[PDB]
Design a protein around this ligand. Structure first.
Ligand SMILES: [Zn+2]
Ligand SMILES: [Zn+2]
Ligand SMILES: [Zn+2]
Lengths: 48, 48, 102, 64, 511, 214, 49
RNA sequence: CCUGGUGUCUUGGGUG
DNA sequence: GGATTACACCCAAGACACCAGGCACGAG
DNA sequence: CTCGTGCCTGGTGTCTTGAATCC
């Protein structure tokens, strides 16, 4: 009961930082994967 | 003493979490809600 | 507490009635007066409380012109002025009144 | 290595505050108080544990 | 009687005539709870009226005060406030009555009391868990620290039971790092850590050979003796009592410039009182503190030598529960001083008029009455202006949803550790909880494992005077501390009574 | 002449000291008691004078020759901040520390007390002794309407109307002068004595409403 | 409508729905800005136009 | 004869 | 030296102090 | 009828000293 009650907030914080790191990443019409600055993260999404 | 006190009130009006010195207090005893504290944290303007 | 308009000393009002002013009563005669007289020569309104411990060597006392008076509490500013009839009587005695009201 | 430290002590003679400098030479167990104002100097023995408050205390007793 | 007299003084030169004004507090008397209407009429208050009309069920408290007037040319029952009465206690008007008349007062015979009534609302005090006082605990320190082991103790008196000060003994030096592995202590109101040998010398025992005879009781133990080696050499140059006491005073948070002729006499107070005050505070008894200090260092090194585990902070025998009694005394103590200073500040104005004060005009009962009411109503444990830093949640509205919930709520305990600090150690069900707190009953969520509930047959010690126990020990063969030598006593057992080392006995089995 | 009394390097020093707000007069008192009590003993208090100016909140000034005497004067005083906060005053600043510092018939003042608090009034005259001043004021009356007052539950301002008083609830004293409920109204205005300390004579700012009226 | 519900609508790609929820269905407000200095310092009397 | 405003800041106890 | 420490929701339970001045009532 | 004392309301202004890991 302690573990479930404690470690739920540990993983809740993990998910929050992950979402903010990745929220602006979108597939564009040329197949590239880019963020809001237009930086290329992958030249083709999922490599396939 | 009077000029430093004007500096003090203008400072804690904007930020009342200045490190190393006592907080401005209301007559009720609880700290004054400065503008900086209005924006930060779960209930502030941005996250809330 | 009241302040003597002539010398600036601060004392409980009844003292002005009981013993007169310890600096001034040779000319002011408050000891042998009525309350109306005491209240015309002493003021309930004054500012700047001064402990004078050493009248004769204090510069503060010399500035306030209390250097020839007795150790005690004095006031920097005493509001009101002596009544013209009392000023006239003091002048008959060779005493020159310099108002302490600013 | 010697330690040159400024202090917030008042000189017992000239009365200027925040003008006493303490030089502690532990290699020879000799502490030195100096006044940045009137220029006096006081010397006293120090151990390894001493601090500017230890010799400034010895200076108060050396006067009285 | 903790501060039994107030004293003033003026050296009359205005024929000097020292006129000490003195006020002495005497007997306490209690009256049954009384409702005083705006009318002025009074009557006995029973709880049912108190709930309905949002009143406070409280007793007026009267205190004898005595005036005295020393003069040297060279009262009665004053009311101090109202104290809330716990229902069904000995001072509640329901304790008598008997079953027939209980029904007429609209009180239910299944209601077992144990709670207060404040502005019509039923408030129960929650037992507060704290660490025991006057016990030595040894803990290990984390890797990025020059300290590896620490001994700690919070000293608290027996009378009142109240906190005083806290003291630590830190062992510096990491594993093959920290060079000289010496030991310094921490003293209340001193800014810096002071090596152990220096404080031993500062108490009146100066040659090395006596110092080591007070700590280690085994001359063969060369490992322990090697670890005390650097402590001797780093405090060698302090070779007598006077320069030791002065070394202390030069750090103890005072003013600058109190000279050696007096800076000793200020440090002698910091050693006589505040440092281990639970042993004694009268003069000429420094033998007990020196012997106790040696015990601490001995315990510190046993853990550092891996001959004894570090103490388990969760062992229930090292814990105490503060219930209604002790909690009120600590709050009443704070408020009674506040009332005291208002009396003192009022005498200095009312005696310049040279008019006999009518006493009843110098005791404002609002200080205690509003103080107790506010803290019981909000749970904020302290002066109202200091609501933060004070502990919250000590008083709570009594849950009356069902009968079982009332029983549980009156038997609840709280550990005030927080929600800050994750880990598990204060939250786990420790083995020593068996039979003392319930293994099943604990809240879900943030309080899980921190709020506990007393097992069905548990009880709480009310407290007992230690003085009869001392008399019994000396009558059956306990030998004083001045007669004790590790060479002669290489095998006898040490005897502790409330954490102070008081004697030694050679045959413990019969005792 | 006052100019011959200016301080010199031969005069004692003056130190300022921080004290608890509102306790400045008490500290000056306490210093005097200590001075007088120790006069002629082997350990006299070597201060000459001490004083506190209202305009300078939280400070006492103490006259002496050595700093140690300042510490001696304040030792044990519960109203003084324990921090070693005293400060030296320059000789050229001394007299300003002791500077002691209006009201004319026909001028305006603002009332500071009572139902007329905050109201503009004309100074009509002052007492012979010199304490209270007779003020001409726009009244705030009810003509006894609900009889069988405070500044928060007062009436609107309106000139006294003697025919309204005649109708509803009055002594004629002269041409245009009536005493109504023991107050005097002349040509519609209240004439009432106030302590001079109960009026404000400086920095008055007439309001929009006052510009419309007067 | 908390931070975690915001993220779910992004994942669905329902950008239109998310805009409406946080404006028309809540605290939508009209402001005037100056085309030169970009501040909300415009004084707008709408009946006088 | 259409419009129509009832608080906040905490603390504590709970639900998933 | 600070900053970090799951999400949402329900409900009950609370609130400035001291000093000075003025006015009214009671007693002489 | 006058003076003194007590109570209430309004205005102005603070201070005896007394949870833990990480970057
Ligand atoms: Zn005079
Ligand atoms: Zn010097
Ligand atoms: Zn613009």
């Amino acid at each position: 009961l302690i573990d479930t009650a404690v470690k739920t907030a540990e993983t809740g914080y993990i998910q929050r930082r992950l979402v903010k790191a990745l929220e602006d990443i979108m597939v564009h019409y040329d197949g590239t994967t880019r963020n809001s600055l237009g930086d290329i993260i992958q030249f083709l999404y999922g490599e396939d | 003493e009077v000029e430093q006190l004007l500096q003090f009130h203008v400072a804690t009006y904007m930020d009342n979490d200045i490190a190393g010195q006592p907080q401005a207090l209301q007559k009720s005893g609880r700290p004054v809600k400065a503008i900086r504290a209005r924006l930060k944290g779960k209930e502030g303007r941005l996250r809330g | 507490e009241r302040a003597c308009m002539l010398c600036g000393i601060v004392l409980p009002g009844r003292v002005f009635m009981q013993n007169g002013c310890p600096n001034c009563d040779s000319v002011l005669n408050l000891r042998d007066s009525d309350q109306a007289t005491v209240n015309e020569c002493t003021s309930s309104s004054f500012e700047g409380l001064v402990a004078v411990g050493d009248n004769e060597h204090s510069w503060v006392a010399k500035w306030l012109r209390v250097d020839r008076f007795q150790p005690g509490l004095y006031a920097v500013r005493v509001d009101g002025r002596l009544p013209s009839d009392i000023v006239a009587a003091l002048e008959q005695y060779g005493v020159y009144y310099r108002p302490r009201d600013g | 290595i010697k330690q040159k430290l400024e202090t917030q002590f008042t000189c017992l003679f000239c009365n200027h505050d925040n003008s006493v400098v303490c030089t502690l030479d532990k290699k020879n167990s000799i502490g030195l108080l100096e006044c940045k104002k009137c220029n006096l100097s006081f010397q006293a023995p120090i151990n390894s544990l001493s601090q500017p408050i230890d010799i400034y205390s010895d200076w108060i007793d050396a006067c009285e | 009687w903790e501060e039994p007299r107030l004293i003033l003084d003026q050296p009359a030169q205005h024929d000097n005539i020292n006129k000490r004004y003195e006020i002495r507090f005497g007997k306490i008397y209690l009256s049954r709870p009384t409702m005083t209407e705006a009318d002025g009429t009074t009557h006995a208050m029973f709880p049912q009226e108190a709930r309905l009309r949002n009143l406070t069920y409280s007793s007026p408290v009267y205190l004898d005060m005595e005036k005295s007037m020393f003069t040297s040319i060279d009262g009665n029952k004053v009311h101090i406030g109202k104290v809330p009465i716990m229902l069904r206690s000995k001072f509640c008007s329901l304790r008598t009555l008997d079953e027939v008349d209980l029904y007429k007062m609209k009180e239910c015979p299944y209601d077992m009391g144990g709670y207060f009534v404040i502005n019509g609302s039923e408030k129960v005090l929650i037992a507060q868990e704290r660490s025991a006082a006057n016990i030595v605990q040894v803990f290990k320190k984390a890797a990025p620290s020059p300290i590896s082991h620490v001994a700690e103790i919070r000293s608290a008196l027996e009378k009142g039971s109240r906190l005083i000060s806290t003291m630590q003994i830190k062992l510096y030096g990491r594993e093959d790092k920290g060079t000289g592995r010496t030991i310094k202590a921490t003293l209340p109101y001193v800014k810096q850590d002071i090596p152990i040998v220096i404080v031993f010398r500062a108490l009146g025992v100066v040659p090395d050979g006596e110092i080591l005879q007070h700590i280690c009781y085994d001359e063969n133990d060369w490992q322990m003796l090697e670890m005390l080696k650097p402590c001797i050499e780093e405090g060698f140059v302090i070779q007598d009592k006077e320069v030791a006491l002065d070394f202390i005073g030069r750090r103890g948070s005072a003013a600058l410039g109190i000279r050696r002729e007096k800076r000793i006499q200020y440090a002698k107070d910091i050693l006589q009182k505040e440092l281990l005050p639970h042993i004694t505070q009268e003069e000429g008894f420094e033998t007990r503190k020196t012997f106790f200090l040696g015990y601490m260092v001995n315990r510190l090194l046993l853990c550092a030598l891996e001959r004894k585990d570090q103490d388990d902070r969760d062992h229930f025998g090292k814990k105490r529960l503060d219930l209604a009694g002790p909690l009120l005394a600590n709050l009443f103590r704070i408020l009674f001083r506040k009332l005291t200073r208002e009396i003192y500040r009022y005498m200095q104005r009312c005696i310049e008029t040279d008019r006999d004060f009518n006493l009843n005009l110098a005791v404002k009962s609002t200080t205690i009455t509003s103080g107790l009411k506010y803290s019981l109503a909000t749970g904020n444990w302290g002066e109202q202006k200091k609501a933060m830093s004070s502990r919250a949640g000590v008083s709570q509205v009594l849950n009356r949803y069902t009968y079982s919930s009332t029983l549980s709520h009156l038997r609840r305990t709280n550990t005030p550790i927080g929600r800050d600090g994750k880990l598990a150690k204060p939250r786990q069900l420790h083995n020593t909880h068996w039979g003392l707190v319930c293994p099943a009953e604990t809240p879900e969520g943030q309080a899980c494992g921190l709020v506990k509930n007393l097992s069905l047959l548990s009880g709480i010690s009310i407290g007992s005077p230690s003085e009869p126990i001392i008399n019994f020990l000396e009558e059956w063969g306990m030998e004083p501390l001045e007669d004790y030598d590790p060479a002669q006593h290489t095998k006898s057992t040490r005897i502790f009574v409330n954490g102070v080392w008081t004697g030694i006995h050679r045959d413990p089995s019969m005792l | 002449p006052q100019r011959l009394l200016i301080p010199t390097v031969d005069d004692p020093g003056i130190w300022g000291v921080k004290v608890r707000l509102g306790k400045e007069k008490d500290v000056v008192r306490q210093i005097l008691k200590k001075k007088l009590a120790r006069e002629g003993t082997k350990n006299p208090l070597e201060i000459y004078s001490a004083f506190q100016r209202d305009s300078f909140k939280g400070h006492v000034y103490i006259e002496a020759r050595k700093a140690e005497a300042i510490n001696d004067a304040l030792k044990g005083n519960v109203n003084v901040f324990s921090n070693n906060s005293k400060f030296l005053v320059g000789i050229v600043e001394y007299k300003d520390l002791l500077r002691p510092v209006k009201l004319t018939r026909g001028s305006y003042v603002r009332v500071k007390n009572g139902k007329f608090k905050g109201d503009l009034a004309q100074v009509d005259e002052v007492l012979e002794n010199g304490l209270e001043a007779r003020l001409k004021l726009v009244p705030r009356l009810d003509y006894g309407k609900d009889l069988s007052y405070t500044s928060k539950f007062r009436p609107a301002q309106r000139l006294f109307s003697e025919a309204e008083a005649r109708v509803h609830e009055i002594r004629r004293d002269r041409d245009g002068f009536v005493t109504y409920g023991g107050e005097e109204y002349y040509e519609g205005f209240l004439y009432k004595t106030f302590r001079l300390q109960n009026l404000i004579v400086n920095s008055i700012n007439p309001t929009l409403n006052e510009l419309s009226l007067f | 409508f908390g931070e975690m519900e915001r993220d779910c609508m992004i994942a669905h790609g329902a950008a239109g729905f998310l805009k409406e929820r946080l404006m028309e269905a809540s605290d939508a407000f009209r402001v005037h800005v100056c085309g030169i200095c970009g501040l909300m310092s415009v004084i707008a009397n709408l009946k006088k136009n």
